Amino acid sequence: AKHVVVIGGGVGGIATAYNLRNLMPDLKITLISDRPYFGFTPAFPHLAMGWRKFEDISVPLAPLLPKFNIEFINEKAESIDPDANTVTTQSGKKIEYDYLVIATGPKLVFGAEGQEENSTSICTAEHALETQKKLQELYANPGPVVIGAIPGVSCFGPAYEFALMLHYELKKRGIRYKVPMTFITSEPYLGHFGVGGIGASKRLVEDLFAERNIDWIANVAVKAIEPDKVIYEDLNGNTHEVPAKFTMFMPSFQGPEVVASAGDKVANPANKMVIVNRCFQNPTYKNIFGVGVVTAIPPIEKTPIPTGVPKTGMMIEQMAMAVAHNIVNDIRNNPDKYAPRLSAICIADFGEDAGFFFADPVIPPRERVITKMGKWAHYFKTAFEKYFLWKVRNGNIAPSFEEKVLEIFLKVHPIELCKDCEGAPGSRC
Amino acid sequence: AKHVVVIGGGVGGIATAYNLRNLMPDLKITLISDRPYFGFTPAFPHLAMGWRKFEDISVPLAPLLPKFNIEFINEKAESIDPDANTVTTQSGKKIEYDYLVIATGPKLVFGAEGQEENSTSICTAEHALETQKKLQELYANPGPVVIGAIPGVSCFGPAYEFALMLHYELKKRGIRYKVPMTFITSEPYLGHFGVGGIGASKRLVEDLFAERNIDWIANVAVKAIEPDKVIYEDLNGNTHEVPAKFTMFMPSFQGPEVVASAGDKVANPANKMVIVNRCFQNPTYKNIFGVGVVTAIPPIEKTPIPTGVPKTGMMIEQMAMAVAHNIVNDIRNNPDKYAPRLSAICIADFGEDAGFFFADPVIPPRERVITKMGKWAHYFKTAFEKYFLWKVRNGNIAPSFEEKVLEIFLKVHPIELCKDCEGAPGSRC
Amino acid sequence: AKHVVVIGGGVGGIATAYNLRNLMPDLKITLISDRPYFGFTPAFPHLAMGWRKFEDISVPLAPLLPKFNIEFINEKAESIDPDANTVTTQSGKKIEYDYLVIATGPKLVFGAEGQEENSTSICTAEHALETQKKLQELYANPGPVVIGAIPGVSCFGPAYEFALMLHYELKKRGIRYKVPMTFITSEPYLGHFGVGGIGASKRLVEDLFAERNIDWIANVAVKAIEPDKVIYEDLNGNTHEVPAKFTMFMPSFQGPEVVASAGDKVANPANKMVIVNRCFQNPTYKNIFGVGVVTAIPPIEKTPIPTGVPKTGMMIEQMAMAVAHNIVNDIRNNPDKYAPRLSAICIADFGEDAGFFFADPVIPPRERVITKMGKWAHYFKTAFEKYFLWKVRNGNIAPSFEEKVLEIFLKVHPIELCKDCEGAPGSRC
């Protein structure tokens, strides 16, 4: 029985571990995670709004993973020795591996002066919770609201979802008229999402904001978040201020120190994310795989204010399906290799209703896109939450019917047989 | 009995006077106006188009106000002595006052050079009927038509109405293809309206115009209107001209000389409009109130070309309602003071169809907006006119059911209890 | 018998010749054409896509024309001597005329460097059949496609068609996601078509390109087309580059030499196109008339990158009716002159669906427009093709019913009685 160590107990890690397990019962699998729970991240904005209890959107891992014959180690992974094939945890426990899957997700950078002190974030359950405590003060004393993304940000979705969910909340409380709302993004235009748009997203989102009276400034670098104002800089280099009593800003992401310590064949020097090829396998150390946000994928377009590419839920689900297959195939001496399609369904919950975004694939050129908005989309996200948590709880992230439902509805094929894995992830075999 | 004097027989004046008489049957009211008729301004564009007889959209006041025990003075109020509590008329007749309501509407400034001479306006019924003559000449032998708003304009609606009405008319006599149409405006973008747009009004008006082949220039200053052309200036300081056989440009507004005649405590030095607080009361002379266009309200937005903020019929009806209660509460020694909501239902007639706008409030940030378009809206404009005229003739501008109706359909309340009057009108109390 | 000579076996020539035949059976008519067949130009993009066989979209003229007493000479008109009322052919045959109709269509100019040998065009049948061959080269070797219009272009429609149709095909073959697409135009914005847009056509095309992932660069000047790339130049004169495995660009138009061989009273000194008045008649030589693409019509607006006005089928077949009547009324001593209305009804085919455009007249100011999209519009283009070729084959381009159907469905009269022809073609009597 070969040994696969997975670092990181999130969407990517869980999915790779369950994929490997369901494809090969006679396989020793160890998962290492610094958090004792899997957290459902797409529900963090709602948690930040106080519309979710943490226990509803999390699954304790240590009592669960043994049920699927997976070893859970509840520590941080400190370093990787890819020559020795070894992972070292923080307490000093060394673990040998035959294959390694890195899935540590994003490491937050609050790159704006004062952002970490005077702003709020929704990227972790921990941050989402101290956001909730702060919104409490906004409702009590309605001042101006500023929301958005700093330079380097690569996950733009949640900030739109927060802006619009907050609008809804204030409007339910009959105080929206006491609260100006500005959205500031490093995107060249609204609805760029770090992907150069999804269909006519720029137009869909611009009307959404105009209809719901949400002022916006795009194509600018947010430099500072003071207790009382947000300072930013446009392409001429002049700085501007905007009054703000409450702010929520997306951090930019970088890779973790664990990856960094594997050397510059594994760790991308620029951002410390995991160097991978079309097959989400490391070029140099071919028993190392990266899955999820931590994977180094080049941007789709070099925008005037730096932006990066989002790794969304469905993309990662495909990454995990491809890496699991490629590991299994290597073990079984099958030369076949798979690249993930990297397509994305994306639902942005605006409170009462929601935006549906489908891009196939996400990195252009695209075969097709779907942009729709409705109440149905909001229910779909609540359903999907309930559904994903059940998958984590029942040992299968990729039940065969999900694949076929996605075929019938969207003509989506999650992974393809790759003829040549040498090349940037996202680039076409 | 206490003595209140209403200066001005327009929307605000009549509304305020009627509300007072209905709250307090035994209160003496004197209304002074320089016109023996009440002008229904919302129908003046149709009068310029020749779809109304002046007699149908006017109400003679002399035989009417004495029916509600309102003393009518058919003279111009010349000066105001606020320390001596007196108004002095054109013939020099001194009338003393306990309370003063100023509702003199706008003093028109034809601020582009050559505008009074070479252009038409639709602001007064005199100018409207004049415009009718010029349209006749136009139909006889077509030429370029340019319509719009100069710098300083705060009433954009009627220009949009007129452009689109004139379109429908030129088209219905098959002569449109021989008539270019350009709309040039001081608004930063189309459908800004001085209010920073209403929902996605900017997208909606740009589409209306493109469909109806109306050319447009926004964010420029009309500097000159000549017999043959219109000269305007963009933000670089560059001059451009546009050929024109017929022009109709909106003048800008300023306070009258009668207001100016009271100190710099009643008359806003920058524009001669009445200094009022949240409760539409003068900060220093507590027995002076302003209603309607005459009131100084800070612009919602400093736009690159100076624009002001409209005071719509519903906004004014609300002002008048708030002021009535404020005066009566003060007479009765009741500490309750009321702010108007300053929301707008605004219908722009386009000939056979029309655009329905609803802003709550008008001054951002907004609780909600409605922007719809259709036939029904045009018919609702004809029917509201008939309704409003009936209101003036029957001594109630504010019957109880009307408020309940607006509450049921739009969830609007015309007036709020104001915790503290001290602050700019429109600002949140 | 008077003798009318038509140069041009295309839409313009045929429709003038047929029209004259139906108005005057005893009139002598001679058609000079270098090509032995009428080509149904609107179906050339489909021919390039390989969805038509040449034989289906063309009519042999040599056997056909004698059936309507039209003498067909299959040679290229070489020179026109307006002082001798003659036309000399490539063999040397001098033909006299009492009236002349110039309808040679466009002489293609491949302005960009490398355009003629490296790009491909769809403007003639030979060029279109040649493009099919290169499209084969692409389907087997997926690479970047770029498509558009060079400076000075005037037929933008076929490029939009082609881009869209090509997208449809790439999707059919499942290779769309392996093939980027960029549309590069001299138009100031998308959907300008050299007409200052039709209705809200800019919003419409932009949105069309977004859903389908066709990138675009507008308001630039294409200067080079190399085997592996396209070089364009922006308004700052800064020179840019984009990769290209396959290209397809519209050439600009100029007048033929046969026109140039007459005075500069007949050939416009700037473009060699035929000088005509409102009545598509030459101001100097009153018995010379021009029909179709060869006619000199001023640009609707002076665009940052030069552009021209399209001459669409409906416009041309209206020139033909106007010119016809003008020759007939001269023969019959009727002082009456007609101008064509010049309204367009242009269906842009996209493969499985299509874009309906109606502009009446094409040249602003307009009486009305209709811009719509759907499957029906695609079945309408196929239907119209079958219908038009029937008209060619059956000898009447303007059946009475067709004008009455146009009247009651679009309120379209094809010609207007014109009190004064002296002026630019397309300007208003």
Ligand SMILES: Cc1cc2nc3c(=O)[nH]c(=O)nc-3n(C[C@H](O)[C@H](O)[C@H](O)COP(=O)(O)OP(=O)(O)OC[C@H]3O[C@@H](n4cnc5c(N)ncnc54)[C@H](O)[C@@H]3O)c2cc1CS
């Ligand atoms: C706020 C927010 C919302 C959000 N919403 C999404 C949505 O509505 N739809 C969607 O499709 N995607 C959404 N995403 C993005 C994406 O789905 C999420 O970021 C995923 O959660 C990312 O998955 P990953 O597997 O890449 O990372 P992870 O966050 O699930 O967690 C990885 C695990 O690794 C652990 N870990 C970190 N560092 C470690 C070290 N050194 N050693 C051991 N383990 C380590 C960590 O505990 C975690 O369990 C959305 C994204 C956001 C965020 S801003």
Ligand SMILES: Cc1cc2nc3c(=O)[nH]c(=O)nc-3n(C[C@H](O)[C@H](O)[C@H](O)COP(=O)(O)OP(=O)(O)OC[C@H]3O[C@@H](n4cnc5c(N)ncnc54)[C@H](O)[C@@H]3O)c2cc1CS
């Ligand atoms: C052309 C035009 C159309 C128009 N349409 C509107 C619409 O469709 N909907 C809407 O909500 N608002 C529209 N408005 C704006 C608004 O409704 C009008 O401007 C109101 O008429 C403004 O009300 P006011 O009471 O502020 O002004 P008034 O003009 O009705 O009455 C002023 C009265 O005062 C008299 N007066 C002036 N100076 C005096 C002195 N010194 N002494 C005594 N009396 C004086 C004056 O004669 C009049 O009776 C629309 C607005 C327009 C117009 S530009």
Ligand SMILES: Cc1cc2nc3c(=O)[nH]c(=O)nc-3n(C[C@H](O)[C@H](O)[C@H](O)COP(=O)(O)OP(=O)(O)OC[C@H]3O[C@@H](n4cnc5c(N)ncnc54)[C@H](O)[C@@H]3O)c2cc1CS
């Ligand atoms: C590729 C392409 C597509 C296209 N599609 C159109 C569409 O879908 N709808 C529409 O309304 N218009 C479309 N057009 C534009 C226009 O309708 C066409 O170009 C017409 O064919 C123009 O008609 P004309 O009569 O102006 O020209 P013609 O092309 O038919 O050719 C006239 C004839 O003259 C002959 N000829 C040239 N030189 C001669 C000399 N010296 N002597 C004698 N005869 C000569 C020539 O052989 C031809 O028989 C569309 C336009 C395009 C094109 S890029």
Ligand SMILES: CCCCCCCCCCCCO[C@@H]1O[C@H](CO)[C@@H](O[C@H]2O[C@H](CO)[C@@H](O)[C@H](O)[C@H]2O)[C@H](O)[C@H]1O
């Ligand atoms: C057990 C396996 C089954 C898994 C479930 C699979 C998901 C099923 C997909 C359902 C299709 C969703 O996509 C569907 O889109 C259309 C819009 O085009 C929406 O329909 C909407 O149409 C128009 C606006 O366009 C509205 O006037 C209408 O009120 C609304 O219903 C549907 O409400 C939505 O459901």
Ligand SMILES: CCCCCCCCCCCCO[C@@H]1O[C@H](CO)[C@@H](O[C@H]2O[C@H](CO)[C@@H](O)[C@H](O)[C@H]2O)[C@H](O)[C@H]1O
């Ligand atoms: C004593 C009671 C009398 C007081 C008056 C009470 C007010 C009455 C309410 C009026 C009804 C509202 O007006 C209604 O607006 C909706 C907006 O979705 C329109 O709904 C629809 O109309 C047509 C299609 O039918 C479209 O142009 C439009 O896109 C669409 O919104 C209705 O055509 C219109 O009739």
Ligand SMILES: CCCCCCCCCCCCO[C@@H]1O[C@H](CO)[C@@H](O[C@H]2O[C@H](CO)[C@@H](O)[C@H](O)[C@H]2O)[C@H](O)[C@H]1O
């Ligand atoms: C005997 C010779 C005479 C034959 C000529 C008859 C022509 C009749 C067509 C005139 C009608 C106008 O053109 C009409 O545009 C409307 C736009 O609302 C389309 O109306 C509709 O299109 C399709 C369904 O048909 C829908 O996707 C769309 O939502 C809807 O708008 C019609 O499909 C089209 O026919």
Ligand SMILES: CC(C)=CCC/C(C)=C/CC/C(C)=C/Cc1c(C)n(O)c2ccccc2c1=O
């Ligand atoms: C509107 C039309 C035509 C179709 C919609 C119906 C669809 C797409 C049904 C598929 C249901 C399904 C299992 C989707 C998979 C799905 C995945 C895999 N991820 O990762 C998500 C992440 C965030 C939000 C939503 C999703 C989501 O819906």
Ligand SMILES: CC(C)=CCC/C(C)=C/CC/C(C)=C/Cc1c(C)n(O)c2ccccc2c1=O
């Ligand atoms: C489409 C939806 C959801 C609702 C529409 C139904 C509505 C708005 C009903 C309200 C009817 C009503 C009594 C309106 C009062 C009303 C007022 C008070 N003013 O001042 C106007 C000024 C100009 C033009 C129109 C008006 C108008 O309609």
Ligand SMILES: CC(C)=CCC/C(C)=C/CC/C(C)=C/Cc1c(C)n(O)c2ccccc2c1=O
């Ligand atoms: C959508 C609406 C309101 C009406 C549909 C328009 C209809 C039914 C028009 C009548 C049909 C008809 C005989 C049109 C004549 C017609 C003409 C005269 N020309 O020149 C064309 C050129 C290119 C493509 C199509 C045409 C075309 O359809």
